Amino acid sequence: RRDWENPGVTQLNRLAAHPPFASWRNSEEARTDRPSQQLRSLNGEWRFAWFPAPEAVPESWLECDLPEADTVVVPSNWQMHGYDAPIYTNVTYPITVNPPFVPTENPTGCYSLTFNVDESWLQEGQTRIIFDGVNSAFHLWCNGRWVGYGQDSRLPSEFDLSAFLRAGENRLAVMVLRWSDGSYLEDQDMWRMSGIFRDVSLLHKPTTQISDFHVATRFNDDFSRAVLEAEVQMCGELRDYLRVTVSLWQGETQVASGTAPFGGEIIDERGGYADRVTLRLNVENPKLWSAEIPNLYRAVVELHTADGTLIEAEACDVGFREVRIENGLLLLNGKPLLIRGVNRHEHHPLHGQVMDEQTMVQDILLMKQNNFNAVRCSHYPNHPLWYTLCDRYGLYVVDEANIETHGMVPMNRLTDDPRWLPAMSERVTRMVQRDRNHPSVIIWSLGSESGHGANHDALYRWIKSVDPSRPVQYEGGGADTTATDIICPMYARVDEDQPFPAVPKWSIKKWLSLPGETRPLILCEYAHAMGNSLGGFAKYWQAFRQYPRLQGGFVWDWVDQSLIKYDENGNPWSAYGGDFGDTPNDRQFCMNGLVFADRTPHPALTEAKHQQQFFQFRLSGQTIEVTSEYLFRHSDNELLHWMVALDGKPLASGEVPLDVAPQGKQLIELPELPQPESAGQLWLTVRVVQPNATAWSEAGHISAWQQWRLAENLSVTLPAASHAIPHLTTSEMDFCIELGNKRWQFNRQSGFLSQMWIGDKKQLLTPLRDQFTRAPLDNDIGVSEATRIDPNAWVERWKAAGHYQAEAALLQCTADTLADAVLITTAHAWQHQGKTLFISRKTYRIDGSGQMAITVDVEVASDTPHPARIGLNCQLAQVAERVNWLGLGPQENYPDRLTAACFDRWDLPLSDMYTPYVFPSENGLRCGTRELNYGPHQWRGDFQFNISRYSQQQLMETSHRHLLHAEEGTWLNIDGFHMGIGGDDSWSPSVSAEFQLSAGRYHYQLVWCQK
Amino acid sequence: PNHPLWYTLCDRYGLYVVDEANIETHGMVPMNRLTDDPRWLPAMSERVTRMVQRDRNHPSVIIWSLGSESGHGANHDALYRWIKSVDPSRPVQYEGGGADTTATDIICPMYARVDEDQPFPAVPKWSIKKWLSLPGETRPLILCEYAHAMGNSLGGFAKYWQAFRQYPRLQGGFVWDWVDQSLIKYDENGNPWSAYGGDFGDTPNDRQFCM
Amino acid sequence: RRDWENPGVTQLNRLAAHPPFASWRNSEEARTDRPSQQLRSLNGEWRFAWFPAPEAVPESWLECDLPEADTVVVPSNWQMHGYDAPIYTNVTYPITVNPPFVPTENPTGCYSLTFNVDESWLQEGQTRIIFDGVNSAFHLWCNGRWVGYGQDSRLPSEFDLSAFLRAGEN
Ligand SMILES: OC[C@@H]1[C@H](O)[C@H](O)[C@@H](O)c2nnnn21
Ligand SMILES: [Mg+2]
Ligand SMILES: [Mg+2]
Ligand SMILES: [Mg+2]
Ligand code: NA
Ligand code: NA
């Protein structure tokens, strides 16, 4: 039998799924959640050997260790050890699409372990092995005898080894297949790896044992009273003396306790469950669980004899909370949620898909620090710890079954085929049976992108019947199917409709009100954070606040799926699809995270942080209105910090504690703000600071901010009359202009300021030329490749219109000497196949104060694709250490993604002004900048800018960041205007109309001086 | 599900058919032990899906049934929905777990009396006339099994048909049952006699209860 | 493997269920519902031998007939020929309640049939066998090699025999 090619065999001899066990033999240990002696990790050094196909594995391996086998760490994905290559493919299956068959050349991982088992574990009781995660299927032998088989690589498979083990030394033999019929259900957009990638362990249970237990919590109208219901099930031999006690603890305080013999109520004509019992406990004024206040209790289930002797104990953390949909809204404890969510794949750049405690806590912290309150287990049940941490730290979780069949044509071919229903069910049911007691799980999910099929309907109903405590959602087949309690579209836009046939992505605001639609709307995936992205993120968040039934979404996604490679020297770099010899692959589509693989923030994160703020602000004259968006908590660790600064110079600053009830308001009266004499804009900057450390943040953590423009004094005083007069040197080739030790040279054949001197020293390495293009962002490229041209992507419009080729033709270059200045007038025209794309009409005025006032007027042909930018560039000779600007920052910000940035005096090292996206693109821009300082140079105006050691051309032509080489000098881009960055998705043009450069006639002015 | 020709014959002679999945677990304690067990979902589903996949084209099939006397379990709920999703042209019924659960479009009790209530704990048989108008109830009532025709019986048959006729939402039932399940045995003279439970050495048995 | 004691295995290599087929190669025949050459009944006389459990079936029975075997009509219930006693029971299962296991002593019926298959049925096309009902589970062999397994004694189990049959005698 080839069980891995039969979706009717998903397992053999596998034990039933159940919630987490430890079989404690001391209730105190159970209560306090201390380690259990009855639970042993088999983690550590294992013996591993790779084979090209299961047929190639020697018979001898069952009986004894292979001399050819290495010693490796388990858990691990074996492609992280180098045995074969990890494949990165998005939609297209990494195997031939031929259900239920897999390739005969099926990489086979042979794991074995020689290990000791103590005598006492075999004299009495049941000993089982637990494989938390095996990708994708496996057979298992113990001491040569065959035990069982298993599938579903994201949930634990367990087997009873009691009869196979002997005292002292034993040997496990685990045969792991990379591909199986199960693979067809596991087509998530991630890396395709394999092996024993999650813990292994041994659990000793008594013969008479707790086999299962459910926790439930119901509430009266106001949540001032609750009933905790505990259904307990047992295996073994029923006795009249057997008892079950459930006790509920809060810290060291016994809150409630109940005891009953086995014997459930009559459920039908044949009686009831004699191997079950349900405990009901009253709890008065329970402390309720939420992401805001993750209040927990502890439940201990003790299986014991009448006379008091404990047989075994099981426990779990209990969070008192109700989740329900009512009148179109998702309520947690009767209050309508706003899901500041993010999707999170299980990813590590060194270990692969192997999860460890440290990184999880690192993710959770970082998330909570950036105003996230919900996470989605895209697209499978996670490592069991993850649920415990979300219980404890406080994040709402969507627990998703490990079913995705994206590559099927059409998408539901399997999920509408009744022969696949059993394999699908076990992926849903065994998740539910596992995670149902974790309070952080508030929503169940039937999987990812498998369209909509009868099987989804069956299974949706199955959960509703089995666990009505939680809503079920599912996006497949149009996001609003009969299989979903929630309209959960992916990448639906705020205002724009996208009526795809059969499965349209409506504007979220419009989707709500479609005839007869009543359900809430929470995007399961939105704001595609690929490279320089998250543009127009603020639009979603405005909509979420105005629309009750729009209750948030989950950003895609948390972390770049970039793996670590090494060069010749041993130096490490970040690799994406293709970099392992994987083909077909999908390049950098695996990197879509708000953070880098190492958990460094992308610039987008701060934008998320700002939009997801729990405090809203309004300004009326000098009254600040602080509005809380918390549902349950009082603002008991929050003070408001305000300052008013004139073009960067702090005038008045202040501090007021916040005392805002949830959903409440607080008015703060700013003291008389003493009006300054000199010219400039006044700015108000409030920030919310948390005086005290919490479990998820340090003291002084900033949780929210906002700015307002106050009064403005416009400059009316004339610059001190220029004592001197600049000198023209008309040549046939050059216009040279001299003042003191400053010299400006204009080339007459090209028309651009070609060189500049301070003393004898050259300032420029390439002349000051107009620029109309940028190094395309992942959003500009979309799905376009060299051999898969999508002519609709912004980049492909630009290429075909000649934007990148077009050379400037000079139309007019004249010079005039004035009363106190030298006036240069230029005009240019960029043409391609005799089509004129742009016209640039400039006037340089160099007065006797040594200042050069540039005036640029650009015409853009209405019938050409709107350009990335309208600006000037040049390569500076100088390489300085610090960049100092007055404008939006400190971080990278773009016109459609600058809400998080503040206007101030910013001073950063040069390296900070470059964002190291793994796929290089235009990056580092700062907008609404009025003053830029670089060494001797200053530029004044109202422009956008970036500043780095890399040319747009280098950026364009280099595929990976690590191959970029610092160029001689400093490249400077100064844009009067720059195009939005898009991001609603990364496969079709996503820059909103208001952020495209379509005016046709643009104007910007610059004052370039050396102060 | 029946011999395949049976459906051809009802199609052509004109009889309304109820097609029932091959699922019955009467013996279990409680009756829904397997049908509430997810590890039993697979086996059950094939018994339903394959029925629909074979018989969905016969005009005589007007109602699908999920089986018989198997309590009420989440598997029934899952499958009921399955049918509704694949074939919306036919109502779905199932008696188990009280005759009016969330897995049935039709209140289909077995041996519910016309006037007399039988208020068994958990799974009561109400009088059909009272059953209809219980708070919140709106479905039609058609007995899946009534008027046990065991031996000298069918007393009180007129009461049902008078009730059916008076009450619009009392739309009838199915008598139990058509034919005595007696088998032929022979004595010492090769003379044929009708036999029932226990007459073959079979034990334990339910004697005449097959006829 | 003891598939009859495992509810996760209800069939092996069984073909997808579907409505009544006849594979007519003539529109009119299909329209008037006439008998079809592509649908052959195999009902009639078979070779049958009873056993008290499967472990008691001699391995030779796959390869060639059993001399002890009788000739009986198919379809039938073997209880009606006298090989064991039919059991009448209402609620109480006829077997011990211990799911998914059955009794080790499991009355096993061995059915065999030698039959012709025409040249034209194997040169091209697909040749399946259809068992409209088999109570309660069965394994199938053809010309000695194993084909598959099927459960549910009230719906037809179907198997693709194309690659098992040989021209003439099978
Ligand atoms: O980042 C690529 C994303 C990601 O794979 C999502 O799971 C899916 O909704 C999708 N469809 N098209 N692109 N994507
Ligand atoms: Mg399989
Ligand atoms: Mg996908
Ligand atoms: Mg079986
Ligand atoms: Na809202
Ligand atoms: Na992706």
Ligand code: NA
């Ligand atoms: Na009526």
Ligand code: NA
């Ligand atoms: Na009977």
